[PDB]
């Protein structure tokens, strides 16, 4: 049924599944970042269930995709909220942090710097929230797909649908065929830098280890049920 | 002159710039041990690196960048570039990685190195996806150049933005080139968009593999080295 969606219905569904903007619990820096990230994880589960073609997959497959993508998804949301705040990361509306505040934690300013650069690449492209929910979904289905045959064909048909959607959004905003091609690529090439940031960030979270730091296969299996 | 080239001119330059296929050092002791296989793979990798630099300098637009920027693109890209060459070579050996004509290894021969099978599996999976997609050599060389220009660009002043913008325009010329390759093949406009997307999404996984790959190596090239080789 998700394969039957028009471009507009795809965006309407993705825009209507958006998670809400959470606030940072205080009224220690690793503490606020960690607690916030745990709380957005809960909302990300119910976001992912609403991504079209996601619940068409077995729960095993659903959780492998979330396991591979959760940090990328957390990060692309951070970068989106941060577009209109050059030089700062809008973790929460009461947690806007600058490059200098990354230095309070050994290891973080490197990820902080990569997130800022992605945020200004979205600013200098004037990334639209319709395109952004598209990329966020692309990340969900794409980042673990390559690890049975009916499942990865269906995922690749839904990913072909979101490509159609990105092209449609670009045609309706007036861009020529050529500008449509180029913008799609520039948007998708940024996903590979987002992958790099997730990997480096994952890497920091194990040196960071206060133990049981990262969402395990079984924890994620419970939250979707 | 890079930004005036026609699609077919870009395909041409890229195809001639391809580095040769090399051979692994000849009759090592087999069966391998962990130290001897890592020794071969390393020595083969190092020898490919020299040819990669000559390759890099012939990628339209690369030599327009400052020495320092060229090195940084390479420091960030070189393992993805090594790994996509392997996947390409190994497309016609299902279940095998053709590291060299004389070094064709299956999954089980990757267990000889602790931590390596996990990497092996990823590389083989990618090679199977390129098979499933019927990846073309003309597309291959466009994606490789895309890797070289893109991976290091989000890490790069008036001059620094000119550097950034020029690279982004060359990437835009490589996109048009892939699209021309697809249009000329007879694919529809929708099919063109979808295949361009599927290919570019594959570069996200190639980035994952290079990162895990870099992790694996540490668990077991300098700026100065790449810069000397570049001049
Ligand atoms: C700055 C980035 C990204 C980031 C962190 N915060 C966020 C909150 C909202 C949006 C983005 C973020 C933070 C971060 C995080 F993303 C996760 C985390 O730990 C989660 C622990 N939970 C146990 C649950 C399993 F059940 C997972 C701790 C963090 F500081 N940071 C990760 C690093 C640099 C280390 F890559
Ligand atoms: C992908 C890859 C290696 C690889 C890398 C990491 C993990 C792994 O399992 C294999 C390994 C390698 C070994 C040492 C270095 I220095 C670099 C690459 O040997 C290679 C040789 C040639 C080539 O084109 C690719 C590889």
Short mmCIF file of C-alpha atoms and ligand atoms in Angstrom, two decimals:
data_model
loop_
_atom_site.label_atom_id
_atom_site.label_comp_id
_atom_site.label_asym_id
_atom_site.label_seq_id
_atom_site.Cartn_x
_atom_site.Cartn_y
_atom_site.Cartn_z
CA UNK A 1 0.00 0.00 0.00
CA UNK A 2 2.94 2.29 0.71
CA UNK A 3 4.06 1.65 -2.89
CA UNK A 4 0.83 3.24 -4.14
CA UNK A 5 1.57 6.67 -2.62
CA UNK A 6 1.78 9.82 -4.73
CA UNK A 7 4.57 12.30 -4.12
CA UNK A 8 2.32 14.63 -2.10
CA UNK A 9 0.91 11.84 0.08
CA UNK A 10 4.49 10.72 0.78
CA UNK A 11 5.44 14.18 2.07
CA UNK A 12 2.15 14.62 3.95
CA UNK A 13 2.80 11.29 5.71
CA UNK A 14 6.45 12.08 6.50
CA UNK A 15 5.62 15.62 7.69
CA UNK A 16 2.74 14.24 9.83
CA UNK A 17 5.04 11.64 11.44
CA UNK A 18 7.65 14.22 12.58
CA UNK A 19 8.80 13.74 16.17
CA UNK A 20 8.27 16.69 18.51
CA UNK A 21 10.99 19.01 19.75
CA UNK A 22 12.04 17.81 23.21
CA UNK A 23 13.52 20.00 25.95
CA UNK A 24 16.67 19.32 27.94
CA UNK A 25 15.99 18.14 31.50
CA UNK A 26 17.30 20.85 33.85
CA UNK A 27 15.67 23.97 35.26
CA UNK A 28 26.89 16.74 33.30
CA UNK A 29 27.06 17.94 29.70
CA UNK A 30 27.38 14.32 28.65
CA UNK A 31 24.48 13.78 31.02
CA UNK A 32 22.14 16.22 29.27
CA UNK A 33 23.20 15.06 25.82
CA UNK A 34 22.71 11.42 26.84
CA UNK A 35 19.32 11.85 28.52
CA UNK A 36 18.01 13.92 25.60
CA UNK A 37 19.22 11.28 23.14
CA UNK A 38 17.50 8.52 25.10
CA UNK A 39 14.24 10.44 25.01
CA UNK A 40 14.38 11.17 21.28
CA UNK A 41 15.04 7.44 20.71
CA UNK A 42 11.57 6.69 22.13
CA UNK A 43 9.93 9.16 19.69
CA UNK A 44 12.14 7.89 16.81
CA UNK A 45 10.68 4.39 17.22
CA UNK A 46 7.15 5.70 16.67
CA UNK A 47 8.39 7.95 13.87
CA UNK A 48 9.98 4.99 12.05
CA UNK A 49 6.76 2.94 12.29
CA UNK A 50 5.05 5.69 10.29
CA UNK A 51 7.66 5.77 7.51
CA UNK A 52 5.85 4.19 4.56
CA UNK A 53 6.92 0.64 3.87
CA UNK A 54 8.67 0.39 7.23
CA UNK A 55 6.03 -1.72 8.99
CA UNK A 56 5.70 -3.86 5.86
CA UNK A 57 9.01 -5.45 7.03
CA UNK A 58 9.53 -8.14 9.64
CA UNK A 59 10.37 -6.91 13.13
CA UNK A 60 13.85 -8.46 12.84
CA UNK A 61 14.53 -6.35 9.76
CA UNK A 62 12.91 -3.24 11.28
CA UNK A 63 15.26 -3.40 14.27
CA UNK A 64 18.41 -3.99 12.22
CA UNK A 65 17.59 -0.82 10.25
CA UNK A 66 17.03 1.22 13.44
CA UNK A 67 20.21 -0.20 14.96
CA UNK A 68 22.28 0.90 11.96
CA UNK A 69 20.61 4.30 11.55
CA UNK A 70 19.60 5.65 14.98
CA UNK A 71 22.62 7.93 15.49
CA UNK A 72 22.48 9.23 11.89
CA UNK A 73 18.80 10.03 12.44
CA UNK A 74 19.51 11.78 15.76
CA UNK A 75 22.28 13.78 14.09
CA UNK A 76 20.39 14.82 10.96
CA UNK A 77 17.62 16.15 13.18
CA UNK A 78 20.15 18.14 15.20
CA UNK A 79 21.65 19.61 12.02
CA UNK A 80 18.21 20.55 10.72
CA UNK A 81 17.22 22.42 13.92
CA UNK A 82 20.66 24.10 13.83
CA UNK A 83 20.44 25.56 10.30
CA UNK A 84 19.23 28.95 11.52
CA UNK A 85 21.93 29.22 14.24
CA UNK A 86 25.37 29.43 12.57
CA UNK A 87 28.14 28.27 14.88
CA UNK A 88 25.84 26.56 17.36
CA UNK A 89 24.14 23.22 17.84
CA UNK A 90 20.49 23.48 18.93
CA UNK A 91 20.40 20.26 20.89
CA UNK A 92 17.24 21.52 22.65
CA UNK A 93 15.66 24.98 22.75
CA UNK A 94 17.14 25.32 26.26
CA UNK A 95 20.42 23.64 25.16
CA UNK A 96 22.10 25.68 22.41
CA UNK A 97 25.84 25.04 22.51
CA UNK A 98 28.79 26.57 20.70
CA UNK A 99 32.00 25.00 19.39
CA UNK A 100 33.81 26.08 22.59
CA UNK A 101 31.40 24.11 24.79
CA UNK A 102 32.27 20.89 22.98
CA UNK A 103 35.77 21.26 24.47
CA UNK A 104 34.29 20.54 27.92
CA UNK A 105 34.25 16.87 26.89
CA UNK A 106 37.38 15.29 25.50
CA UNK A 107 36.58 13.96 22.05
CA UNK A 108 33.45 15.96 21.30
CA UNK A 109 34.67 19.07 19.52
CA UNK A 110 35.58 16.91 16.50
CA UNK A 111 32.02 15.67 16.17
CA UNK A 112 30.73 19.13 17.10
CA UNK A 113 32.77 20.59 14.21
CA UNK A 114 31.49 18.03 11.71
CA UNK A 115 27.89 18.69 12.75
CA UNK A 116 28.28 22.46 12.31
CA UNK A 117 29.73 22.01 8.81
CA UNK A 118 26.82 19.81 7.83
CA UNK A 119 24.45 22.41 9.27
CA UNK A 120 25.90 25.20 7.13
CA UNK A 121 25.90 22.98 4.07
CA UNK A 122 22.16 22.66 4.63
CA UNK A 123 21.97 26.44 5.12
CA UNK A 124 23.97 27.22 1.98
CA UNK A 125 21.68 24.84 0.05
CA UNK A 126 18.51 26.30 1.69
CA UNK A 127 17.39 22.75 2.50
CA UNK A 128 13.58 22.50 2.68
CA UNK A 129 11.73 20.58 5.40
CA UNK A 130 9.96 18.55 2.73
CA UNK A 131 13.36 17.45 1.40
CA UNK A 132 14.67 16.94 4.90
CA UNK A 133 12.00 14.45 6.00
CA UNK A 134 12.77 12.64 2.73
CA UNK A 135 16.49 12.33 3.54
CA UNK A 136 15.69 11.33 7.12
CA UNK A 137 13.60 8.42 5.77
CA UNK A 138 16.20 7.53 3.12
CA UNK A 139 18.68 7.23 5.98
CA UNK A 140 16.34 4.93 7.87
CA UNK A 141 15.86 2.38 5.07
CA UNK A 142 19.26 2.72 3.41
CA UNK A 143 21.89 2.57 6.16
CA UNK A 144 21.32 -1.07 7.10
CA UNK A 145 19.67 -2.51 3.96
CA UNK A 146 23.00 -3.99 2.81
CA UNK A 147 23.40 -6.76 5.41
CA UNK A 148 15.80 -11.57 2.73
CA UNK A 149 15.42 -11.08 -1.02
CA UNK A 150 11.80 -9.94 -0.86
CA UNK A 151 12.69 -7.57 1.99
CA UNK A 152 15.59 -5.72 0.32
CA UNK A 153 13.63 -5.47 -2.94
CA UNK A 154 10.71 -3.86 -1.11
CA UNK A 155 13.08 -1.44 0.69
CA UNK A 156 14.64 -0.55 -2.65
CA UNK A 157 11.17 0.07 -4.13
CA UNK A 158 10.31 2.43 -1.25
CA UNK A 159 13.70 4.17 -1.69
CA UNK A 160 12.92 4.54 -5.42
CA UNK A 161 9.64 6.14 -4.30
CA UNK A 162 11.36 8.72 -2.06
CA UNK A 163 13.70 9.54 -4.97
CA UNK A 164 10.63 10.20 -7.12
CA UNK A 165 9.38 12.39 -4.27
CA UNK A 166 12.60 14.42 -4.06
CA UNK A 167 12.50 14.96 -7.83
CA UNK A 168 8.82 15.97 -7.66
CA UNK A 169 9.44 18.48 -4.86
CA UNK A 170 12.24 19.93 -6.99
CA UNK A 171 10.15 20.19 -10.15
CA UNK A 172 7.36 21.96 -8.21
CA UNK A 173 9.86 24.49 -6.76
CA UNK A 174 10.76 25.42 -10.34
CA UNK A 175 14.16 23.80 -10.86
CA UNK A 176 15.05 22.63 -14.35
CA UNK A 177 15.65 18.95 -15.07
CA UNK A 178 19.41 19.57 -14.79
CA UNK A 179 19.11 21.43 -11.49
CA UNK A 180 16.88 18.62 -10.26
CA UNK A 181 19.62 16.04 -11.00
CA UNK A 182 22.38 18.07 -9.37
CA UNK A 183 20.45 18.90 -6.21
CA UNK A 184 19.38 15.30 -5.68
CA UNK A 185 23.06 14.27 -5.85
CA UNK A 186 24.28 17.05 -3.55
CA UNK A 187 21.62 16.02 -1.05
CA UNK A 188 22.49 12.33 -1.32
CA UNK A 189 26.27 12.94 -1.20
CA UNK A 190 25.72 14.64 2.17
CA UNK A 191 24.24 11.37 3.46
CA UNK A 192 27.69 9.82 3.10
CA UNK A 193 29.18 12.54 5.31
CA UNK A 194 26.34 11.92 7.76
CA UNK A 195 27.29 8.26 7.78
CA UNK A 196 30.90 9.28 8.54
CA UNK A 197 29.76 11.39 11.49
CA UNK A 198 27.63 8.58 12.90
CA UNK A 199 30.56 6.19 12.68
CA UNK A 200 32.98 8.60 14.37
CA UNK A 201 30.33 9.36 16.99
CA UNK A 202 29.62 5.67 17.67
CA UNK A 203 33.39 5.37 18.09
CA UNK A 204 33.41 8.11 20.72
CA UNK A 205 30.54 6.51 22.64
CA UNK A 206 32.57 3.35 23.38
CA UNK A 207 35.60 5.26 24.63
CA UNK A 208 32.94 7.30 26.49
CA UNK A 209 31.54 4.02 27.90
CA UNK A 210 29.73 4.25 31.18
CA UNK A 211 28.64 0.73 30.08
CA UNK A 212 25.46 -0.16 28.15
CA UNK A 213 25.88 3.12 26.26
CA UNK A 214 24.51 2.07 22.87
CA UNK A 215 21.09 0.63 21.87
CA UNK A 216 21.37 -3.16 21.78
CA UNK A 217 19.47 -5.39 19.34
CA UNK A 218 17.08 -6.63 22.03
CA UNK A 219 16.30 -3.25 23.63
CA UNK A 220 15.16 -1.94 20.25
CA UNK A 221 13.11 -5.12 19.69
CA UNK A 222 11.07 -4.35 22.81
CA UNK A 223 10.37 -0.70 22.02
CA UNK A 224 8.69 -1.37 18.67
CA UNK A 225 6.42 -4.12 20.09
CA UNK B 1 39.60 23.88 -18.37
CA UNK B 2 37.82 21.22 -16.28
CA UNK B 3 34.38 22.87 -16.09
CA UNK B 4 33.89 23.09 -19.87
CA UNK B 5 34.34 19.38 -20.68
CA UNK B 6 31.48 17.54 -22.31
CA UNK B 7 30.10 14.40 -20.71
CA UNK B 8 31.87 12.19 -23.24
CA UNK B 9 35.09 14.18 -22.69
CA UNK B 10 34.89 13.58 -18.92
CA UNK B 11 34.21 9.86 -19.42
CA UNK B 12 37.23 9.79 -21.72
CA UNK B 13 39.67 11.51 -19.35
CA UNK B 14 38.49 9.37 -16.41
CA UNK B 15 38.81 6.12 -18.39
CA UNK B 16 42.38 6.80 -19.52
CA UNK B 17 43.40 7.84 -15.99
CA UNK B 18 42.55 4.40 -14.60
CA UNK B 19 45.47 2.92 -12.63
CA UNK B 20 46.79 -0.47 -13.74
CA UNK B 21 45.93 -3.73 -12.07
CA UNK B 22 48.81 -4.85 -9.90
CA UNK B 23 49.98 -8.27 -8.68
CA UNK B 24 50.54 -9.38 -5.13
CA UNK B 25 54.10 -10.39 -4.29
CA UNK B 26 54.85 -13.77 -5.81
CA UNK B 27 54.80 -17.17 -4.19
CA UNK B 28 54.40 -16.20 -0.58
CA UNK B 29 54.18 -19.15 1.78
CA UNK B 30 50.66 -20.55 1.72
CA UNK B 31 48.61 -21.38 3.74
CA UNK B 32 48.68 -17.85 5.15
CA UNK B 33 49.13 -16.84 8.76
CA UNK B 34 47.71 -13.67 10.28
CA UNK B 35 51.02 -11.80 9.95
CA UNK B 36 51.76 -13.01 6.41
CA UNK B 37 48.34 -12.20 4.92
CA UNK B 38 48.33 -8.76 6.53
CA UNK B 39 51.84 -8.33 5.13
CA UNK B 40 50.70 -9.09 1.58
CA UNK B 41 47.54 -7.02 1.73
CA UNK B 42 49.55 -4.09 3.13
CA UNK B 43 52.28 -4.33 0.52
CA UNK B 44 49.69 -4.53 -2.27
CA UNK B 45 47.84 -1.56 -0.79
CA UNK B 46 51.00 0.54 -0.58
CA UNK B 47 51.84 -0.17 -4.21
CA UNK B 48 48.33 0.77 -5.32
CA UNK B 49 48.69 4.09 -3.44
CA UNK B 50 51.38 5.45 -5.79
CA UNK B 51 49.15 4.76 -8.81
CA UNK B 52 46.23 6.34 -6.99
CA UNK B 53 48.09 9.65 -6.71
CA UNK B 54 48.79 9.70 -10.45
CA UNK B 55 45.15 8.81 -10.88
CA UNK B 56 44.10 11.60 -8.53
CA UNK B 57 46.04 14.31 -10.44
CA UNK B 58 44.23 13.37 -13.68
CA UNK B 59 40.75 13.62 -12.18
CA UNK B 60 39.41 16.79 -13.85
CA UNK B 61 39.57 19.62 -11.31
CA UNK B 62 41.82 17.94 -8.75
CA UNK B 63 45.01 19.86 -9.70
CA UNK B 64 43.16 23.19 -9.51
CA UNK B 65 43.20 22.76 -5.73
CA UNK B 66 46.00 23.77 -3.40
CA UNK B 67 48.54 21.07 -2.48
CA UNK B 68 47.23 21.11 1.07
CA UNK B 69 43.63 20.56 -0.08
CA UNK B 70 44.60 17.77 -2.51
CA UNK B 71 46.29 15.87 0.34
CA UNK B 72 43.28 16.28 2.62
CA UNK B 73 40.88 14.92 0.00
CA UNK B 74 43.22 11.91 -0.28
CA UNK B 75 43.74 11.38 3.45
CA UNK B 76 39.93 11.16 3.82
CA UNK B 77 39.25 9.19 0.62
CA UNK B 78 42.07 6.73 -0.01
CA UNK B 79 40.57 3.68 1.65
CA UNK B 80 37.16 4.17 0.01
CA UNK B 81 39.08 4.47 -3.27
CA UNK B 82 41.02 1.29 -2.59
CA UNK B 83 37.85 -0.50 -1.52
CA UNK B 84 35.73 0.50 -4.49
CA UNK B 85 38.46 -0.68 -6.86
CA UNK B 86 38.43 -4.06 -5.11
CA UNK B 87 34.65 -4.35 -5.28
CA UNK B 88 34.73 -3.44 -8.97
CA UNK B 89 37.47 -6.02 -9.78
CA UNK B 90 35.68 -8.69 -7.76
CA UNK B 91 32.27 -8.22 -9.43
CA UNK B 92 32.71 -11.32 -11.62
CA UNK B 93 33.96 -13.56 -8.77
CA UNK B 94 30.86 -14.08 -6.58
CA UNK B 95 32.00 -14.87 -3.06
CA UNK B 96 35.56 -13.79 -3.84
CA UNK B 97 37.63 -10.61 -3.51
CA UNK B 98 40.11 -10.27 -6.36
CA UNK B 99 42.77 -8.38 -4.43
CA UNK B 100 45.12 -9.27 -7.28
CA UNK B 101 45.01 -11.74 -10.18
CA UNK B 102 47.34 -13.88 -8.06
CA UNK B 103 45.41 -13.15 -4.86
CA UNK B 104 41.78 -14.24 -5.15
CA UNK B 105 40.37 -14.80 -1.65
CA UNK B 106 37.03 -16.19 -0.50
CA UNK B 107 35.17 -15.37 2.71
CA UNK B 108 36.79 -18.14 4.79
CA UNK B 109 40.28 -16.96 3.91
CA UNK B 110 39.39 -13.71 5.68
CA UNK B 111 38.99 -15.42 9.04
CA UNK B 112 42.77 -15.89 9.07
CA UNK B 113 43.02 -12.26 10.21
CA UNK B 114 41.17 -11.56 13.46
CA UNK B 115 38.43 -8.99 12.74
CA UNK B 116 38.64 -9.21 8.95
CA UNK B 117 35.68 -11.40 7.93
CA UNK B 118 33.29 -8.66 9.02
CA UNK B 119 35.06 -6.36 6.57
CA UNK B 120 35.28 -9.07 3.89
CA UNK B 121 31.54 -9.67 4.14
CA UNK B 122 30.78 -5.98 3.60
CA UNK B 123 33.10 -5.75 0.57
CA UNK B 124 31.55 -8.88 -0.99
CA UNK B 125 28.03 -7.59 -0.31
CA UNK B 126 28.85 -4.35 -2.14
CA UNK B 127 30.31 -6.33 -5.01
CA UNK B 128 27.08 -8.33 -5.25
CA UNK B 129 25.02 -5.13 -5.22
CA UNK B 130 27.08 -3.72 -8.13
CA UNK B 131 26.49 -7.03 -9.91
CA UNK B 132 22.72 -6.83 -9.27
CA UNK B 133 22.77 -3.24 -10.56
CA UNK B 134 24.85 -4.16 -13.65
CA UNK B 135 27.23 -1.34 -12.74
CA UNK B 136 29.04 0.01 -15.82
CA UNK B 137 32.73 0.91 -15.99
CA UNK B 138 31.85 4.40 -17.16
CA UNK B 139 29.67 4.78 -14.05
CA UNK B 140 32.33 3.17 -11.88
CA UNK B 141 34.95 5.80 -12.82
CA UNK B 142 32.44 8.62 -12.18
CA UNK B 143 31.66 7.27 -8.72
CA UNK B 144 35.36 6.90 -7.86
CA UNK B 145 36.05 10.51 -8.82
CA UNK B 146 32.95 11.51 -6.82
CA UNK B 147 34.43 9.77 -3.76
CA UNK B 148 37.75 11.59 -4.14
CA UNK B 149 36.12 15.02 -4.38
CA UNK B 150 33.31 14.57 -1.84
CA UNK B 151 34.55 12.72 1.26
CA UNK B 152 37.09 15.37 2.20
CA UNK B 153 35.16 18.43 1.14
CA UNK B 154 33.05 18.92 4.33
CA UNK B 155 36.32 19.20 6.28
CA UNK B 156 38.00 22.07 4.37
CA UNK B 157 38.29 32.51 4.05
CA UNK B 158 37.49 33.76 0.56
CA UNK B 159 39.95 31.23 -0.87
CA UNK B 160 38.59 28.26 1.12
CA UNK B 161 35.06 28.87 -0.18
CA UNK B 162 36.34 29.26 -3.75
CA UNK B 163 38.02 25.87 -3.17
CA UNK B 164 34.77 24.46 -1.79
CA UNK B 165 32.61 25.95 -4.56
CA UNK B 166 34.87 24.82 -7.44
CA UNK B 167 34.85 21.24 -6.09
CA UNK B 168 31.09 21.35 -5.81
CA UNK B 169 30.81 22.52 -9.44
CA UNK B 170 33.04 19.63 -10.65
CA UNK B 171 30.88 17.17 -8.66
CA UNK B 172 27.90 18.76 -10.42
CA UNK B 173 29.67 18.11 -13.76
CA UNK B 174 30.19 14.49 -12.79
CA UNK B 175 26.46 14.15 -11.94
CA UNK B 176 25.50 15.44 -15.40
CA UNK B 177 27.98 12.98 -16.85
CA UNK B 178 26.36 10.02 -15.08
CA UNK B 179 22.96 11.25 -16.22
CA UNK B 180 24.18 11.56 -19.83
CA UNK B 181 25.57 8.01 -19.61
CA UNK B 182 22.11 6.87 -18.48
CA UNK B 183 20.13 8.88 -21.04
CA UNK B 184 22.40 7.63 -23.84
CA UNK B 185 21.79 4.04 -22.70
CA UNK B 186 18.06 4.61 -23.30
CA UNK B 187 16.82 4.81 -19.71
CA UNK B 188 13.80 7.00 -19.05
CA UNK B 189 13.98 10.19 -16.97
CA UNK B 190 12.51 8.44 -13.91
CA UNK B 191 14.91 5.50 -14.33
CA UNK B 192 17.77 7.99 -14.62
CA UNK B 193 16.89 9.68 -11.32
CA UNK B 194 16.41 6.38 -9.51
CA UNK B 195 19.65 4.81 -10.72
CA UNK B 196 21.63 7.93 -9.86
CA UNK B 197 20.14 7.77 -6.39
CA UNK B 198 20.80 4.03 -5.94
CA UNK B 199 24.44 4.48 -6.96
CA UNK B 200 25.00 7.47 -4.67
CA UNK B 201 23.33 5.70 -1.72
CA UNK B 202 25.89 2.94 -2.26
CA UNK B 203 28.65 5.46 -1.50
CA UNK B 204 27.20 5.81 2.00
CA UNK B 205 27.92 2.10 2.59
CA UNK B 206 31.38 2.43 1.05
CA UNK B 207 31.98 5.16 3.60
CA UNK B 208 30.84 2.80 6.40
CA UNK B 209 33.23 0.09 5.17
CA UNK B 210 36.20 2.45 5.02
CA UNK B 211 35.47 3.57 8.58
CA UNK B 212 35.14 0.06 9.97
CA UNK B 213 38.16 -0.79 7.83
CA UNK B 214 40.14 2.03 9.41
CA UNK B 215 39.01 0.88 12.84
CA UNK B 216 40.12 -2.69 12.14
CA UNK B 217 43.60 -1.59 11.06
CA UNK B 218 44.16 0.52 14.18
CA UNK B 219 42.89 -2.32 16.42
CA UNK B 220 45.57 -4.59 14.93
CA UNK B 221 49.60 7.39 5.08
CA UNK B 222 50.90 10.53 6.73
CA UNK B 223 50.20 14.03 5.49
CA UNK B 224 53.95 14.35 4.77
CA UNK B 225 53.96 11.16 2.69
CA UNK B 226 51.00 12.09 0.46
CA UNK B 227 52.41 15.58 -0.16
CA UNK B 228 55.84 14.36 -1.29
CA UNK B 229 54.23 11.81 -3.64
CA UNK B 230 51.97 14.57 -4.99
CA UNK B 231 54.99 16.61 -6.27
C1 LIG C 1 26.64 15.46 19.78
C2 LIG C 1 26.28 14.01 19.42
C3 LIG C 1 24.89 13.85 18.77
C4 LIG C 1 23.83 13.98 19.82
C5 LIG C 1 24.07 13.66 21.11
N1 LIG C 1 22.93 13.86 21.85
C6 LIG C 1 21.92 14.34 21.06
C7 LIG C 1 20.59 14.71 21.34
C8 LIG C 1 19.82 15.16 20.29
C9 LIG C 1 20.33 15.24 19.00
C10 LIG C 1 21.63 14.89 18.69
C11 LIG C 1 22.44 14.43 19.74
C12 LIG C 1 25.40 13.13 21.62
C13 LIG C 1 25.09 11.79 22.29
C14 LIG C 1 24.33 10.79 21.67
F1 LIG C 1 23.87 10.95 20.41
C15 LIG C 1 24.04 9.60 22.34
C16 LIG C 1 24.49 9.39 23.64
O1 LIG C 1 24.23 8.22 24.31
C17 LIG C 1 22.98 7.55 24.10
C18 LIG C 1 22.83 6.49 25.20
N2 LIG C 1 21.54 5.76 25.15
C19 LIG C 1 21.62 4.42 25.78
C20 LIG C 1 20.48 4.09 24.81
C21 LIG C 1 20.36 2.61 24.45
F2 LIG C 1 19.25 2.08 25.10
C22 LIG C 1 21.29 5.02 23.90
C23 LIG C 1 25.24 10.38 24.26
C24 LIG C 1 25.52 11.57 23.59
F3 LIG C 1 26.25 12.51 24.22
N3 LIG C 1 26.50 13.16 20.61
C25 LIG C 1 26.99 11.83 20.23
C26 LIG C 1 28.50 11.66 19.99
C27 LIG C 1 29.32 12.91 19.71
C28 LIG C 1 29.20 10.96 21.16
F4 LIG C 1 28.55 10.84 18.87
C1 LIG C 2 40.06 -3.29 1.46
C2 LIG C 2 41.49 -3.73 1.61
C3 LIG C 2 42.03 -4.07 2.81
C4 LIG C 2 41.39 -4.13 4.13
C5 LIG C 2 41.47 -3.01 4.97
C6 LIG C 2 40.93 -3.04 6.24
C7 LIG C 2 40.35 -4.20 6.71
C8 LIG C 2 40.30 -5.33 5.89
O1 LIG C 2 39.72 -6.46 6.36
C9 LIG C 2 40.83 -5.31 4.61
C10 LIG C 2 43.47 -4.49 2.94
C11 LIG C 2 44.40 -3.40 3.41
C12 LIG C 2 45.50 -3.77 4.17
C13 LIG C 2 46.40 -2.81 4.60
C14 LIG C 2 46.21 -1.49 4.27
I1 LIG C 2 47.58 -0.04 4.91
C15 LIG C 2 45.11 -1.13 3.51
C16 LIG C 2 44.20 -2.07 3.08
O2 LIG C 2 44.00 -4.96 1.71
C17 LIG C 2 43.65 -4.35 0.55
C18 LIG C 2 44.53 -4.37 -0.51
C19 LIG C 2 44.21 -3.76 -1.70
C20 LIG C 2 42.98 -3.16 -1.84
O3 LIG C 2 42.69 -2.58 -3.03
C21 LIG C 2 42.08 -3.13 -0.78
C22 LIG C 2 42.40 -3.74 0.43
#
